[PDB]
Amino acid sequence: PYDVFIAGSGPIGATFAKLCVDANLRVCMVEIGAADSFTSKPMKQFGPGQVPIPGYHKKNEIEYQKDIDRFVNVIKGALSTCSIPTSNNHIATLDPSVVSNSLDKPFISLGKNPAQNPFVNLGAEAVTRGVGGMSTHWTCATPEFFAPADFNAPHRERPKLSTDAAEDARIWKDLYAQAKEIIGTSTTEFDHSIRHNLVLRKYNDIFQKENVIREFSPLPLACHRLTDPDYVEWHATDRILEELFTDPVKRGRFTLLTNHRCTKLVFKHYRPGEENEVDYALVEDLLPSVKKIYARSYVVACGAVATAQVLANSHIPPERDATIPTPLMPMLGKYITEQPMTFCQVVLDSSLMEVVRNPPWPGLDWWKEKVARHVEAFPNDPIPIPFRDPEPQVTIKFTEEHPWHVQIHRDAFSYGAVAENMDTRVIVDYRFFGYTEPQEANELVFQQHYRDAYDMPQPTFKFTMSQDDRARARRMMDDMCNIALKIGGYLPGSEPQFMTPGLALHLAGTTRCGLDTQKTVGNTHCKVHNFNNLYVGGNGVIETGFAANPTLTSICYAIRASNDIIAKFG
Amino acid sequence: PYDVFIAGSGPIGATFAKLCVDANLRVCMVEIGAADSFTSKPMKGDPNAPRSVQFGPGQVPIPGYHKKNEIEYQKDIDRFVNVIKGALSTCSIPTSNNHIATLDPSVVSNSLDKPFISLGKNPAQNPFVNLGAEAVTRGVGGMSTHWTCATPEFFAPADFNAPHRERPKLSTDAAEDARIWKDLYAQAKEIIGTSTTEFDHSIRHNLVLRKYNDIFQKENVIREFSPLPLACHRLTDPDYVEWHATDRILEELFTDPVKRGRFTLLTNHRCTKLVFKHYRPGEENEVDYALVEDLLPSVKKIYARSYVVACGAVATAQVLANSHIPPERDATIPTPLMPMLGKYITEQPMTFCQVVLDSSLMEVVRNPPWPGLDWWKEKVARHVEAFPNDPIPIPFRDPEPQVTIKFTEEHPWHVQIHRDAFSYGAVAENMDTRVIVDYRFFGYTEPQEANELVFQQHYRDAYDMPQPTFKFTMSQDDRARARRMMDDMCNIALKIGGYLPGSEPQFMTPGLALHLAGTTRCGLDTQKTVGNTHCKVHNFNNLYVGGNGVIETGFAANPTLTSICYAIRASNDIIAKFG
Amino acid sequence: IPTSNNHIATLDPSVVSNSLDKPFISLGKNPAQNPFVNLGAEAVTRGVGGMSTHWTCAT
Amino acid sequence: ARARRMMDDMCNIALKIGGYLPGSEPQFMTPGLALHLAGTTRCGLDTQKTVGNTHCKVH
Ligand SMILES: *Cc1cc2c(cc1C)Nc1c([nH]c(=O)[nH]c1=O)N2C[C@H](O)[C@H](O)[C@H](O)COP(=O)(O)OP(=O)(O)OC[C@H]1O[C@@H](n2cnc3c(N)ncnc32)[C@H](O)[C@@H]1O
Ligand SMILES: *Cc1cc2c(cc1C)Nc1c([nH]c(=O)[nH]c1=O)N2C[C@H](O)[C@H](O)[C@H](O)COP(=O)(O)OP(=O)(O)OC[C@H]1O[C@@H](n2cnc3c(N)ncnc32)[C@H](O)[C@@H]1O
Ligand SMILES: *Cc1cc2c(cc1C)Nc1c([nH]c(=O)[nH]c1=O)N2C[C@H](O)[C@H](O)[C@H](O)COP(=O)(O)OP(=O)(O)OC[C@H]1O[C@@H](n2cnc3c(N)ncnc32)[C@H](O)[C@@H]1O
Ligand SMILES: OC[C@H]1O[C@@H](O)[C@H](O)[C@@H](F)[C@@H]1O
Ligand SMILES: OC[C@H]1O[C@@H](O)[C@H](O)[C@@H](F)[C@@H]1O
Ligand SMILES: OC[C@H]1O[C@@H](O)[C@H](O)[C@@H](F)[C@@H]1O
Ligand SMILES: [Mn+2]
Ligand SMILES: [Mn+2]
Ligand SMILES: [Mn+2]
Ligand SMILES: [Mn+2]
């Protein structure tokens, strides 16, 4: 038997694999999707003594470094919508002899969820299936979560790991330091971008003179600029898995089964509230069947929706709208949280081009030389910013006084048609993410009689944000308009707007882990209550309402859980 | 050093690689793009192989795999349109200076006399003579990693001196030409893995094929409907298909250690230009070396006994144009060493529509009239039992139709009646996908000298190669055929269904077929060709071309299979001369 | 209303078309108007009452 | 400069009582849409810079 079985090969599952292998444990990881993105590294380019490493970021391919607007297509092709409501719309202009729906015989459409109420849905919530999970397309933003000065403040982003405030703080500090190294967070990789510096420095100058000061800083990113500074390597699961492929000793302790579905775990017994154990994982090989995989410990790291889906499916030992009850894990799927998001784009003020030509800040000879050079080579370009200058990567850290997360940047995930007519150097994006309070009645439940395309129980969302959440969302939209208009004016088609619920993909709380046993699925080590050898990972473990991007904080938890596993099962 | 240098790793370059390595020659292939789509196969002779798991020890990754083979896309095929749009880089986009009236008046703006300057728009391009949807894919396997896999033969008329033919002449003797093509086509179908039977137990395919033959067998002009030949095979789990791509061609160059030893594939390596022994027109000449650039974080000379440019129809001409510069702002690169380079280009006008199947055909699905269709009745019975309330009795996941009408000179176009991963508008949110059927009719254009691809001296693409510009105007005869084709499509479509809102009969943008041909055209008439019928470039003993750019005729059918035939023919010349 | 000469890529190839050098002549467009210095939505109403037969009546 | 201030004021004021209706988010309209074109026959005290006097008699 393996020492550790892991379902899922995203960055969290990879963290478990890496840490467990480094501690001399034998690990078997199942991934339901395909290894579809690779780099290569030499053994301790895809020819001789080099080894192929999957879970590489798709954006690292030179074609997307050159024509970055093409990458929206990658992301749209990677995302599979979780819950799509049925509908029965009349199509008036059909040819009258063709197949048609009617009031009494609607179409029955493969893939839709008849149980979903569209008014309580997270309609843009989605999943990516493949080695690396969502990390093969993500934006790589890795902020820390906010912790208030007072450990008993009414709200915090950063969960509590201890009732002892000073220990909690020291533990998080080092965890965040470790998770930064695992994923390779940096704040300096745009420090020689004109656009980045223009936006950062102008905003700080403006907000120093405003009646309420706001601090702008570089968005921390999991990436590194390459020796040819036109290119950036964005980090993904390949960085975490690397030595499991390139070190022959580690490679010998790691098995990765791709196109394998973890269908469910089978338990010693099905009695709620008594000590229990996983007996085996039931796994199906999806290519052209069923395997029991035995290990001493089991980790479900399938992302926020699918981790709960696996655990719900496991309640079934081996009215049409009935859901699977989950009394062995009563808090499964409860208290779920997602982030409201507002968006707009602006075109920079024409007066800022004078700033580009004559910047007032010291230490900027590098910028002066890039502008002078471009100006001399393209005297008729109305924009003096060099052609390939990187986009801005600016944030304002969450505070309780302005309790949302701000990104002022350019993202590969566009939301409508490129502006054919505007030059891309002068466009800036704003995404502002809010938080939702965890509430028991906000839920992810799984259908007994409808299944997804991979024959797993269909997820259904029952999400309604609170009055306080709505009041903050109004303030956030007001903040975005005010901030955006300081440096530019709205680009047509990207005026200030809310996006579809779920579109942030930051769903959390579906397998919530914390100190309060009766309201969580697992403890602070992510061990599921009453199971001696079952652990969860991913954003689903995060029990607080937060606004910042969660993956770094999720990796902290993966570290913790791996060390518990090592402690117990090494 | 190397016996053969190959620029390009699409299915044509791969064909040269496979055949040459099979003949014990040492091959170096450069590919400007990345290996980005893989499968894994056991490595022959590796102690791990018998028990191995995909992408484990001792399997080897094989690039150029079809992206549509991921189960994600076999289950959600409408998502694949995004893969296709992600893979296509448009060749020539005209500049424009449109006024945006609703900009905030404080922001950066274009003006009449100070337009924005965009990298990679082409100021030299006249939009009215463009192939504005012509595009390329840079990656291992080229476009074969997303293609639709249709592999028909080209039409050869009964009379060898008929005015028009799809299939080019390889000999002046009619009988030798026919024998040559018969052997090449057999070999090309085995290389790519063509089959006509992979949809034979789809209700939708069978419905569409049988109905149309029943209708047109009765009409006073008979039209014959047949399965579209497809480079694919259905898997032992019939819910999946393995679509074929360059991985099938290269497989043994990665799984066989003896072959792997003779093959080197350098990815993110641009062939910038070939450098010639000399630069005098009309004189015997040869390639000295290939100038290659590693584009990853440099400039290297690669020597071989023979050189193959298989970079697709546009890029092959681009590499050869740029090789004219040894080591008025709208001036193009003259190409006097290869005077027919980029002349006589052809492309396929295309009409498109979709229909919804007639309600009356659902009764045919429940009670097919044709004898011996027990398999169909069984599938339908299973579905109606599981989903008695479903108005559509076709089973979920029944495969799409895959039907064609072979080109004939009486109706001189290529028909596909199918469902294609390349959707052109928004998916139909309200209509069930089981009852939708697509129609793509492709015409041909006559080769004319004045139709050309040229390359800009002062403008470059994103990979620092000379910018392509098209000067393309179809002929009067090409236009009259296009109208007849549109008319035929409307007539044929409406026999089994009605147009789906949003996909009513329409022409598509010039270039969308991506069947550009004739840019390095090869044939018997030396004076009007870039290469001979072995695709050896005139006046160079050691330079060959491949791809759809070699095809010298006006054709309507999908060209890949015929391009493979030329690759075999050319490889054999290489092997006989240099191996 | 400024003149324009935009290419329509998807016309049926047998139909009447503009070209680079032979644009349509569209009566009532203004060849002298620079679009970037226009008041493009400026308009008149001809009829008894002029604009007062549709205006919002804010005074 | 005044138009940017005005856009900001509009966003601030609108959000005090409601939220933007999809499709009618804050935007500038095409110049001339107000139909409040003026000064084409300007009347005033300064004879050298007007068309008419303060009684609108043409000079
Ligand atoms: C798509 C996306 C995602 C993110 C960004 C932008 C875009 C468009 N931006 C972003 C994000 N997060 C950040 O913190 N900062 C950024 O700037 N994105 C989200 C981020 O990508 C996720 O938070 C992260 O991957 C979460 O990692 P994880 O917990 O490992 O989960 P994944 O979803 O990545 O991978 C899970 C994995 O398990 C597989 N699976 C699912 N079900 C099964 C079963 N039954 N058996 C076996 N395997 C299963 C999935 O296929 C998947 O690979
Ligand atoms: C995209 C597309 C393509 C086709 C269909 C559908 C779609 C959406 N469907 C289809 C086609 N063909 C048919 O016969 N039947 C169908 O059902 N499609 C076209 C087909 O895909 C092409 O005909 C075929 O690949 C051509 O093969 P090729 O001649 O080998 O050319 P490629 O373009 O595939 O690959 C060339 C290759 O060379 C590289 N390159 C370009 N420039 C350079 C330089 N300078 N140095 C090195 N390498 C270079 C490319 O990047 C590319 O990989
Ligand atoms: C169309 C409209 C206009 C107004 C608002 C809403 C809408 C959509 N709302 C509005 C406006 N004005 C306000 O102060 N507040 C409101 O809430 N609108 C504009 C207002 O409607 C005009 O300012 C007003 O009519 C102007 O009055 P006018 O100076 O009398 O000019 P008109 O354009 O109304 O009438 C001129 C008139 O003369 C005719 N004409 C033009 N050329 C000739 C020649 N050569 N020969 C003879 N007659 C001529 C016209 O045809 C017209 O009827
Ligand atoms: O929609 C794109 C956004 O998606 C979110 O998942 C990311 O965390 C942001 F960084 C990103 O801007
Ligand atoms: O545009 C998609 C079409 O493009 C062409 O490249 C293919 O040959 C067709 F089979 C396909 O239907
Ligand atoms: O566009 C309608 C607007 O146009 C103007 O002509 C009027 O003065 C405004 F009151 C009215 O709301
Ligand atoms: Mn929400
Ligand atoms: Mn710890
Ligand atoms: Mn611990
Ligand atoms: Mn054409």
Curated annotation (Swiss-Prot), chain A:
InterPro entries the record matches: FAD/NAD-bd_sf, GMC_OxRtase_C, P2OX, P2Ox-like
Gene3D superfamilies per the UniProt record, alphabetical: 3.30.1920.50, FAD/NAD(P)-binding domain
Reactions listed under catalytic activity: D-glucose + O2 = 2-dehydro-D-glucose + H2O2
Residue numbers of Tele-8alpha-FAD histidine PTMs: H137
Post-translational modification: Not glycosylated.
EC number: 1.1.3.10
GO CC entries: periplasmic space
Comment on bound cofactor: Binds 1 FAD covalently per subunit.
UniProt cross-references to SUPFAM superfamilies, sorted A to Z: FAD-linked reductases, C-terminal domain, FAD/NAD(P)-binding domain
Record keyword Oxidoreductase present: yes
Annotated substrate binding sites: Q407, H409
pH dependence (record): Optimum pH is 8.0-8.5. Active from pH 4.5 to 10. Stable from pH 4 to 11.
Cofactor(s) needed by this chain: FAD
Record field: temperature dependence: Optimum temperature is 55 degrees Celsius. Thermostable for 2 hours up to 70 degrees Celsius.
The UniProt record lists the keyword Ribosomal protein: no
A Pfam family hit: GMC_oxred_C
Annotated PANTHER family: PYRANOSE 2-OXIDASE
Protein name in UniProt: Pyranose 2-oxidase
Organism: Phanerodontia chrysosporium (White-rot fungus)
From Swiss-Prot, chain D:
Subcellular location: Periplasm
Posttranslational mods: Not glycosylated.
Active site, renumbered: H36
Induction and repression of expression: Induced by carbon starvation.
Subunit structure: Homotetramer.
Recorded family membership: Belongs to the GMC oxidoreductase family.
Role noted for this protein: Catalyzes the oxidation of various aldopyranoses and disaccharides on carbon-2 to the corresponding 2-keto sugars concomitant with the reduction of O(2) to H(2)O(2). Plays an important role in lignin degradation of wood rot fungi by supplying the essential cosubstrate H(2)O(2) for the ligninolytic peroxidases, lignin peroxidase and manganese-dependent peroxidase. The preferred substrate is D-glucose which is converted to 2-dehydro-D-glucose, an intermediate of a secondary metabolic pathway leading to the antibiotic cortalcerone.
Protein name: Pyranose 2-oxidase
Full-protein positions shown: 518 to 576 of 621
